[PDB]
Symmetry: C3
Subunit: 133 residues, 3 copies
Amino acid sequence: TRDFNGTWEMESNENFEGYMKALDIDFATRKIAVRLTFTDVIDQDGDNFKTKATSTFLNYDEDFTVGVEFDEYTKSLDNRHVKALVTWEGDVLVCVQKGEKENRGWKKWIEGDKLYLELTCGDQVCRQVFKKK
Amino acid sequence: TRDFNGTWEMESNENFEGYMKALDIDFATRKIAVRLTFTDVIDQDGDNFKTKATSTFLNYDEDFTVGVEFDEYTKSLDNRHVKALVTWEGDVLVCVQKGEKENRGWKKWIEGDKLYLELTCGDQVCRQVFKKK
Amino acid sequence: TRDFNGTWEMESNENFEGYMKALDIDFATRKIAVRLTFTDVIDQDGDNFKTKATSTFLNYDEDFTVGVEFDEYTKSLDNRHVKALVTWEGDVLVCVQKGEKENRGWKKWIEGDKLYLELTCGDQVCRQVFKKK
């Protein structure tokens, strides 16, 4: 068919960095464009085309069951192999990521309708607070 | 007028990188801000102001008629001027972009309900598959 | 409570770069990840978790009343402390940012239905024009 009308969400993106490298794009923008997904909207009236490609960030997914130690490759941060276990300690969700780094993990707990998350690695701690919508 | 209330979308941004370099901003973050557009929301209560600037990536637009050679400035990627012509090759939309780069263009075609796009430049080719919403 | 179901919007993110630096993450991806805000969707069925992390850009806010000299931290740009005051020059909103840099500030004014913004620092000036929606 010759009908390209519609809104198209990307499901695959192969050799994006090689194509961008052929265009002489800098390394910083290259490592950021490989972390994006694109949605192209196309209006076609016979031979007249209007196309706009919207770019968004790739959505990171993590599914797990409490008590089952699963293999995790942090494809979002440092790309390392860790073995992660999520445990219940009272009402605090505790997770340990055993690997090259020590004291690495995170801890979640809820207060009212705000979520508190502590990302730990070594002696460094990152604190993030979320509100519920 | 002194009334600044409303939502304001950026249409032009001249010498942003020079201004940021004067602010001693690192090169990586500068190369990320040169690819953004801004939308500012303004609340004005007499002399009271509340401002929020939303940042997004500039979206690539391509409007054309098959067979008509149009001038295209390839923002979002390499910022180059090419002269592009779109042809029908069977049911495949073929486009050639004459410019500094050779073998540069793209090819779209539909199979089933998936859109396939092949971006080529030099000896590098990028393959993209899209699903309809 | 042990119920984490829902959509959680980030409101605070402390020491994200230190945590990422402890993970040996490169400087480019760190300076873009020190931006951004995160929204995590969590579906919890007893002990089974399914999480999706949506990424967007950090907005950065600046709220002020005309005539009060306020402390401003340019988190959107260079992360410096300046003391900024916004003045009226006719119908033009003028603001000067006294700090480590000199001749630093901005000027906004409306003509027709377009907002004109001049970012100045050193001998470099950036001009931005916005249209109203």
